[PDB]
Each structure stands twice: as C-alpha cells, then as structure tokens.
Amino acid sequence: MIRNRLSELLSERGLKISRVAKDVKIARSSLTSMAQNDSEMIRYDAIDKLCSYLHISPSEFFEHNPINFDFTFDEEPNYKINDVFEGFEVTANITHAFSIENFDFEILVDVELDNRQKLNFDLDVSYKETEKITNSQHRFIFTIKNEDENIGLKKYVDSLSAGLKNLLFKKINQKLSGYVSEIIVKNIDDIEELFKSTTLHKEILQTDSRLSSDIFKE
Amino acid sequence: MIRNRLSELLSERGLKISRVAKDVKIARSSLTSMAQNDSEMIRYDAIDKLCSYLHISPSEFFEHNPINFDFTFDEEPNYKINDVFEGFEVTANITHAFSIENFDFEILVDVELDNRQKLNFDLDVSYKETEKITNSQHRFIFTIKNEDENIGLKKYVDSLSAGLKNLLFKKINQKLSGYVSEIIVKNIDDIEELFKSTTLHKEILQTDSRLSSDIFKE
Amino acid sequence: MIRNRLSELLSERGLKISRVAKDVKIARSSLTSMAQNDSEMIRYDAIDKLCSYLHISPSEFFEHNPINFDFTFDEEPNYKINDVFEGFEVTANITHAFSIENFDFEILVDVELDNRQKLNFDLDVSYKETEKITNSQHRFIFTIKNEDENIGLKKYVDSLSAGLKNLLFKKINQKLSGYVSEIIVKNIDDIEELFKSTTLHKEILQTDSRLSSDIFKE
Amino acid sequence: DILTQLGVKDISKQNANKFYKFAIYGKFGTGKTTFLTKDNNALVLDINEDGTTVTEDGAVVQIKNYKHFSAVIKMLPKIIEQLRENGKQIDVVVIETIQKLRDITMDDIMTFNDWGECATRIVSIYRYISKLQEHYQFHLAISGHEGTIEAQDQIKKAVISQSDVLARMTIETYQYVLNAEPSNLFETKIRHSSNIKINNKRFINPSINDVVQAIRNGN
Amino acid sequence: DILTQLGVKDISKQNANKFYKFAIYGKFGTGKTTFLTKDNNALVLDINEDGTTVTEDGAVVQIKNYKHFSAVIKMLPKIIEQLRENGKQIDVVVIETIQKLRDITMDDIM
Ligand SMILES: Nc1ncnc2c1ncn2[C@@H]1O[C@H](COP(=O)(O)OP(=O)(O)OP(O)(O)=S)[C@@H](O)[C@H]1O
Ligand SMILES: Nc1ncnc2c1ncn2[C@@H]1O[C@H](COP(=O)(O)OP(=O)(O)OP(O)(O)=S)[C@@H](O)[C@H]1O
C-alpha cells in the first residue's frame, strides 16, 4: 500500500490546485489526477518540482505501509436476470428495464503480512436489494454471506491508517462495480429513449454497486 | 478399478476447488475434471503438487481394488421405432416425435478375479417404458430380462467399496445412453421447432437411459 | 519429487520388459519409456493393470518426497567462441571445428521445504575444459565457481533417497546440455563431411555437457 | 394400433367439447370488445392500446414489444394455471388487434419476401395457440377493424380459413346486434353440425357463451 | 411471481379509480373550454392562444414554441407537485388545440 499525500498537504497550506499548477508548470489535469490516487505512474520531475515548491522532503510526499492485499473474482458467477418491461423507455428508472432474481459469487482475498507468511480469507458475496440513492440514479447493494468465519480479515483492515483504508475501499468497490455492470450489460439488450439520448447500456455502466459488510466500515 | 480421492479429501478439509487451483497453480477446469473421475490421464506434476499441499502420501490419493469388470454390447441389436407425428414441432415432448415398440439386446460382462481365473455372465436387456424425470426431460428405462441366472454377478458387485461402486454404475450407464441414443438418432429424421432452436436429434442425444435392475442397486 | 518404481520392481521379480508388455497388453515402447522416468503423464489404466499383475498396492508403485527443487538459467549468458578451422571436414573431431574461449552464466535454484518457507541459492557456472569420453564423442565440462557460499544446498540434496537423487541429476544435466548446445549451434556455421553424412550442427546437438561440482556427487 | 400410430381420430368425440375460435371484425365504437369480455371470464392481450375500461372483471396484459408478445405466448400455459390458482376464471384469450400484430411482426423482420415472412409468423402463432387450445380448454378470439376485416389477403385468407366463427358487429332506440347471416355485402360464417339449426343468426346484446350455446345446442 | 414478472394485472382493481382521457371537439363559440375548466381545478396548456378569460380559477401556461412544449411535458411531474404544494388544485391537464400541435411539430420536423 502506498499513496501520494498531495491532497492533504495542499489543504493544510491552503494553496489551490490552479495556483500550484501555474507555478510548477504542471498541467492542471495531471496534477488533479495525481491529487487523487487515480494515476498509476508519477514522473521523477513532478516529485522534485512539488517537493522544492512546498519545502517538503520526499518522505512526506509518500505514505507507506508494508501490508498488501489482493482480490480475485470468480470467473464463473451464478446470475439470474428477469426483464421487467413496463415501458422503461418513457421514464429512465433502471428497475423497470430489468430485475436481478439472484447474483452470488466468491471473492478470494490474500492478506500478505510484512513477513513472507500470508493468510487466505474467502468471501462469498450475494445480491440483497437495489437502493435508490437519488431519483435518477440507483446503487446495487451486495452483502457478504459469511462474515463470522472471516472476522480476522477485519482486524488486519482497521490496522491501516485512515487515508490508506479509504484508498483500499475505493479499489474494492471500483472492481465490484465493473464486474457486476459488465455481466448485466451482456444479458440485457439496450432500450433507447423516445425523447442527449440515454440508452439502457449507458445507464447500466454509470450505475455503481457498493459492498455493504461489517468487515469494511467506511 | 482405481479412482482419485481428491473430491473426498478436499471436502473433509473444507478447502474449496477455487482456492486449491489458485495455490497449486493448476487450471480450475482441469482440477474440477480430475475431482470427478472423468479424466483418463493424470500428470506426475499434479500428483506431487497436491500431495505436498494436503500433506497426503500418494497412497491416500488413489483407491485400488484388484477386481476388474468388462462390458461388451451386441453389434446387431433388435430395434423397432414407430414415428408418432402429433406435431412435436410445437411442444418439445420427445414422446410425440417417436415411440419405441421394442428394443432388446445382450451385454456380455466378464468379472475377472484377482487370480487369473475369470467368470462370464451374460445379461439380456429390454425396453420397458419412457419415464418423465421433468416436464422438459425424459429418461428411457431398460430392465434386465434374466436376473435369476446372473445372481452371482451381484455378489461380486456389492463387494466393492461405495466409491468404486458409484464409479462402475456411472460407466455402465454412460455407455448404455450412448449406445441407445446413437441407434435412435439414425432411424428418426430431425424436426426443427417453429420458435436457441432445439432440433429433435439434439434432444435425443441429451436424453439419458438408466438401467433398472436388482444386480445394480445404486 | 515423484518417480515410478517399475524398473526396480521388475528387476527384483526378474520379469523381462517384453513379457510384461505382452501380458498387460501395453505397447513395449510406452512401458520402456515409463520404466524410465522420461514420460510426463501416466494413464489410470496402466496404474491398475500393472498393480494387479505384480500384486503391488498403488503406494509401492510411486515414491514420494515433499522436497521440491527449481532451476532457472540466465536469459543473457556471456559466451566467446573462436573458429579453429584445421579441416574438421576430414576427421569428425569437434575440437577442430570450434573452440570455446569462455562461457559463464548463473543458475538460480530455490529449495522449497515441506513448510511454506523456501531457501534461495545462486550458482555461478563457468567453462573448464572439453573432455574426450571416446574417440568420436566429447563432453563439455562446466564447474561451479562459488561452492563455499552454497554449501547448505548440498545438505538438502543428499537428504533425498538414491533413486530421487539420480533423477534430479539427470534433470539438471539434460537442461544444461540443451542450453549450452543451443547457444553454440547458433554462433558456429555447419560444415558437411566429404565422405550417412554428419553435419557439424548434428554433432554439436549430440554432444552432452555434464556439470562437475562438489554439491552434486553422483 | 395402426390407427393410434397415425393421427386418425373419431369426430363425434372431437366435436363434443371443442373450443371454437371466434373472429369478430367491427367498425369504430361498435362495442366489439364488450362482446368478448361480457362473460367477465377473459384474459385480454391488448396491443399498444387500453380498452379494458369497458370490461368489468378479468385479467389484462399490455403488449408493448414483439419480444414481449413472444414471451407471453410461450409462457401462456404457465400463466393460465396461475390465474386459475388465484381463482380468476379464464375461458378465453383475446388479442385486441390483428393490424397491430402486422405492425409489430413487421418491425421484428425489418418486400414480398418480408410480407411472406410476416404471414409465416401469423400462421405459426395460430398453430402454437391451437395445440394449447385443445390442452387448456381456452376459447381463442381475435378482433380487427373494418376497412371485410382490413388487412392483406395472405393474412385474411389464413385468418378466415382457421377461424370457426367470423362475425361482423353493427349498431342498428339504438340496439347492438351481431349479424352472421350470409350476405354478398359483408362476409360472415358460423359453423354448426347438420342436425343443429340456427333459427336466428343475429344476436342482440351478444356474449361468447350465447354463441357457444347456439353452436352446440339448438338455437 | 411469473404473473408479476409479466405485466398481467387484475381489471377490477385497475378500473376502480382510473383517470379517463376526454376528447371534446366543437364548432366555434360552443363554450368547449368552459366545460374543461368549469370545475375550476384545471391546468391549461394553451397553444398560441389565450382563452383563459372564460375560466374563473386555475393555472394557465402559454405555449409559444415546440421547444417550450417539450420542456413543460418533461417537467410536468415536478410542476404538478408545486401547484399542489402552493395549494392550487390540479386534477386535469388540458391541451387547447390539436391542430396547433400539428402546426408546431411540423415546424420542428421542417
Ligand atoms: N346444406 C346447408 N344448408 C344450410 N346451411 C348450410 C348448409 N351447408 C352449409 N351451411 C352453412 O355453412 C356452415 C358450414 O360452412 P362450411 O362447411 O365450413 O363451409 P365451406 O365452404 O365448406 O368451408 P370454408 O372453410 O368456409 S371455405 C353451416 O354451419 C351452415 O351455417
Ligand atoms: N355552460 C354555459 N352556459 C351558458 N353560456 C355558456 C356556457 N359555456 C359557454 N357559454 C358562453 O360562451 C362563453 C365562453 O365561450 P368559450 O368558452 O370561449 O367558447 P369555446 O368554443 O370554448 O372557444 P372559442 O375560442 O370560441 S372556439 C361564455 O362567456 C358564455 O357567453
């Protein structure tokens, strides 16, 4: 686990992203992406320009923790989806377009310690309900079936610092949302609205699924 | 007779097939096939990786019994099949497509003892009825005509361990289902449904025939 | 590590390979290959026929040891080869065709214990001389440069049974011979004899290289 | 039995409880749907329309897509069983408009090749419904708009041939009467056995039951 | 529920409180708008015309463009909620002229 601390440092000093980009001569879009931990690679030039600009040693810029987590999703999931019809084309409410009877699968997590020794925990996740976050948008909610057998996994998770924990939760969710969305888009055909145009597939991809479980509390 | 004991060992230890495949670096599909006794050959590498992983000696992995059975099916069977018409094309109920007036033949079984001496038993099998296991699927049922002359064969069969006996019963059935299905598909022409498409031949091949007799009780 | 014990069992009982092949109805060529540990896969049918024929349990047929060794050869070796000319075409003595000034590289060995813990040993191997086993055939001899740092590797090797140790030594040599031979054949062009015909490349491939070191004593 | 091996079957037993198909074509506001659902024991598969208001009781399923139409027909056996299990009485399955079936099938296939395929879809539907019709004892009824029923002959030919009773409903105080009496101006046909005689082929305030009783028992 | 999975629904419950649509065609000066707004609980979407004078109470929205027409229809759910929140009673939505709908849609497609 490792993340850049640029977002926190800039907030304490109170400098805005726009001013920093203008001075360090780094394009705003790249600096914003790097402010989030979204980017995968960082150019040596960026590490020095920023470190000289904020009088921060390279140590401060990066937060490290020897722990390391891995997540694998089953190649073959069990999914049943029933078309609901009900004229979704008029009002864009996904529930009208399709309903999930049951979607369950397994995620295998390996918590590698600082020592070479690793621990294996197996999580089984099932569909529960489709919550409506806002009138136009919904979030599929999935709950871990077995949590009592995997209580130990929680002890390793909360040991991380808050910043790393928020990063890990984003990673587990982004993957889950991509996995479930990709499976559904294939089974259900797209429907285009009468009255720019928002096809059903585009709405399904936009939809996000967030795991609801005791292990992850944030 | 010889079978792998992987399915039983994994169940007692409680390990799932997915986790074992990820660790021993063996592809899930191969490990699942080998979990069943379907595969014909096993790679030396697989025997050692699994044996080191479950702390099991090679002895435990394989179950052996000196008995050995052989089955031969008559090249020329006596079969009479009468087309029923009745618009099978609309509803996929095999009975409508064709009816078996009478299908009888002989299966020759040689029970070779541990000693060189072998015993020969001759079984005559005839058609009885077509049971409907589910609304969409049926199982042809064949009954052995002479069982009193071949009572001794039963004494050799039940002497095997339960795991070997279940394997032998699968082998006798798989062959029977292939034999009868292949004969019928040739005599009856295929009919394609009006409303993916399931032709009559595909349904006939899917159909399974299970022998019903006192000798085999499981 | 795992090997078939067929060669030893047949020798004690005194049965010849030809008679066993005729009885168990297994082709001589396959049984001979399986008598050696050359084959990679064994058919379940072979394990039972032989076990019933020699009244041996499956346990006896296979010898197992939880230890496991891995060998990796450097992708980029350092090699210098100088053409000697001297009319090799007349007399087929490889030395006349080419001379190795110096060929050195590294082999990385990982001795994985029964426990998950593994030990890493790094071997550096260099060319020493080309011994003449017979007038028409030679064996390149390579000696490990650093052996004192890797004394511990020897303690793990001699712990194996003699049959497994002989197998491991064959595996390390076969790979070495293929590695060095493939490198040389590319650098030196082939020369065909005046007076069936034996080209230089064919002779180089036939040539075998055996590692000479304290760690491996057999 | 060579008889049983072939499809030969006795007529007296077949015509005893047969469920007849009914095609009723009418002009606008002739209350054609009223007739079909007057019995209050009907399942209406309406297409891109909602005329269930005239009906008092029954089950109605809107059809919005050709795909939706295929699904309901394929699962129709299962459906009939459930409504009957709920206690709802379904004796007749009604398709509100033949012209809409032409429109939807055309979209699914989208020339004379196209028209022939459209006819093939229509003929296939009737054959499928009929085999279930004998199995589940449900009368079938299809209704269309006058423009003879308006459509292309290939469809008309198939519909008229298969339909047992074809009737035209007109309003003649004003009275609502279904006239199946033979006539050059409009085409009607009611099928009854030689012994059965229809003294009156015009029915005022008609219902599917009344027609059934007239065609089975003496008018 | 296979019934619920498909759209099959009971008629007795559907026809109990159904809101019927009403089309009223009339000659000039027949007081056709009076009928629609007599209840004084109506929202009139008049098109390029102003006949709200005959009505005593209610809400009237002039429609001047096809674009304006599309917007009011799309946001009509939100609108009904607000007039009811203000306490205005809307039970019927009226489009004054079908011929004007022909004229506006024609301009949009031309
Ligand atoms: N001899 C008859 N006397 C009186 N009415 C008759 C007579 N024959 C037929 N009908 C009438 O015609 C009906 C039967 O018509 P069908 O025999 O089906 O006609 P069809 O021309 O043979 O067949 P399609 O299918 O209409 S081309 C009877 O139920 C009567 O209404
Ligand atoms: N129920 C009624 N009783 C008596 N007079 C009425 C009635 N309804 C309408 N009127 C008369 O008609 C007037 C209203 O006519 P409108 O409602 O404007 O006619 P309209 O046909 O709806 O509209 P246009 O613009 O004339 S086509 C009232 O002021 C009365 O003079």
Numbering used by the authors:
A (entry chain 2D), B (entry chain 2E), C (entry chain 3E): 1 to 195, 201 to 223
D (entry chain 1E): 10 to 119, 127 to 163, 180 to 204, 213 to 259
E (entry chain 1D): 10 to 119
Pull text from the paper.
Here, we show that the phage satellite SaPI2, which does not encode orthodox anti-phage defense systems, provides antiviral immunity mediated by Stl2, the SaPI2-encoded transcriptional repressor. Here we have focused on two recombinases, an annealase called Sak, and a recombinase called Sak4, belonging to the Rad52-like and Rad51-like superfamilies respectively.
The Stl2-Sak452A complex also included ATPγS and the micrographs showed highly homogeneous distribution of particles. Notably, Stl2 maintains its multimeric disposition, but this time adopts an open washer-like state, whose openness is not sufficiently flexible to decorate two right-handed Sak452A filaments continuously, and after the completion of one turn the two Sak452A filaments collide to one another. Stl2 introduces the end of the wings (the loops 1 and 2) between Sak452A protomers so that one Stl2 protomer interacts with two Sak452A. Our Stl2-Sak452A complex suggests that Stl2 prevents the Sak452A recombinase from forming long filamentous structures. Once more, the inhibition of Sak452A by Stl2 appears to hinge on its capacity to oligomerize. To validate this, we conducted another spot assay using the SaPI2 stl2-sheetCTD mutational variant challenged by phage 52A. Notably, the antiviral immunity against phage 52A was nullified.
